């Protein structure tokens, strides 16, 4: 039982790490999109304020 349990824990941790890696990839893509969008939004606010004087 202990041998099989340790094998299963190794497999489960490997799969969990793989899933966390896929989720990290997706969230990194989302974070980059959001960061660029925030830069653009702040810059457009500044531009509109400057041109609206």
């Amino acid at each position: 039982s202990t041998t099989s349990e340790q094998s299963a824990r190794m497999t489960a941790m490997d799969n969990a790490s793989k899933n966390a890696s896929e989720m990290i990839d997706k969230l990194t893509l989302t974070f980059n999109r959001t960061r660029q969008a925030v830069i653009t939004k702040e810059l457009i606010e500044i531009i509109s304020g400057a041109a609206a004087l």
């Binding site: 980059n32 960061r35 660029q36 653009t40 531009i47």
Partner: protein, 467 residues
Amino acid sequence: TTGRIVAVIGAVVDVQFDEGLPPILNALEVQGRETRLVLEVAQHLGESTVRTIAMDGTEGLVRGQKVLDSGAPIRIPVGPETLGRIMNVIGEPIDERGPIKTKQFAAIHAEAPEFVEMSVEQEILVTGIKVVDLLAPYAKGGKIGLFGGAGVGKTVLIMELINNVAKAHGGYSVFAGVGERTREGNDLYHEMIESGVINLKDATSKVALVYGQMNEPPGARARVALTGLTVAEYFRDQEGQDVLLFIDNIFRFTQAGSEVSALLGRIPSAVGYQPTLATDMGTMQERITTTKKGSITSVQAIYVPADDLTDPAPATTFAHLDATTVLSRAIAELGIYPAVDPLDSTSRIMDPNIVGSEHYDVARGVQKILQDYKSLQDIIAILGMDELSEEDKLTVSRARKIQRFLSQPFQVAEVFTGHLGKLVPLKETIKGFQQILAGEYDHLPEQAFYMVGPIEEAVAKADKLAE
């Protein structure tokens, strides 16, 4: 024609021409200046006024200073006498070795070759480097992106490419440094002098440097890539040969363009870049092509902001790249040189229709075996080497031999490796890797493949170290 400076806002200068206006992109020289100041026209505001971006510090200018219209855009001295000479964006030498004497001058604002001045067939540029020529061949007249760029061999690789291209095909090269650190610029000058690609005595240089310093106004760092293109276009058209053009860095090209656009008073685009980002890049990258006379193969060092591959700068540059090289810190650790990531490197012409079926099959087999070894390394780390089969230990051995064989000794690094540099032709590389994949050399030791030229050198090394 003579005008007057009417306004000076930062690096932007508004001039007034009572007689006749210069066309856009012309170069104007400010009279009454201790050091040559050149202004590039960018707008026609009306009322005979033009707005110009300054190529040098505008401090000390007065409203009324006379400005003389040259009549043509920035014209630089191009020819065979620029080889081994550093010169800034406006063509003035900055290496203090006297004037760049030439009988030719070229305007830096030219147009891409017309649709009929274009090679219709792809080609391959043989650089004499195993990894580059096998896993990511460099298309002739195609942009190559080069990643990494920190203590991994970027400069030594650039120098080796210069040497091989000037030795195999005999073409010269240009090194346009866009926004170049002065410390690193001087260091590079001296490294080139040491390795021999520049010769201050006998005039047998193989590279012409063009430095856009990092402390020049934004209007100068934005145009040095064009000066480099002009120096290389001379060799392509006039000398009718294949040139190399190293642009280090291209992200700094985009940054300088963005700063100039902001200074002129233009609304920024998506991430605060110039609204003309795509065209600003395209006008330059479209002059690096294979005309029917010669060709220019460019090598951009590329920086990815925030490690974001979708940022408008690399998202726009990657649209132009025809290949990719990825120097990796993780491979210089292993002592492999050049530390080119065999798997992350990419090429558009790695296609059986272009590079031929045998080259394509060898490259695909090498990539597959390297991926297999990479996958197996996890099993080795976790379950221990014992767990492998006999049809997997063999692949591990073959992949280690291939990794060793992909390393090479450079001619411009004989003071780092104690060996003598090798310029491996293409057929030698393909045959060597085909033989290693076939298994013909499974009996040799792995270290017999480390840092050798063609496969026959591996055989000789095995004989010399076993006997």
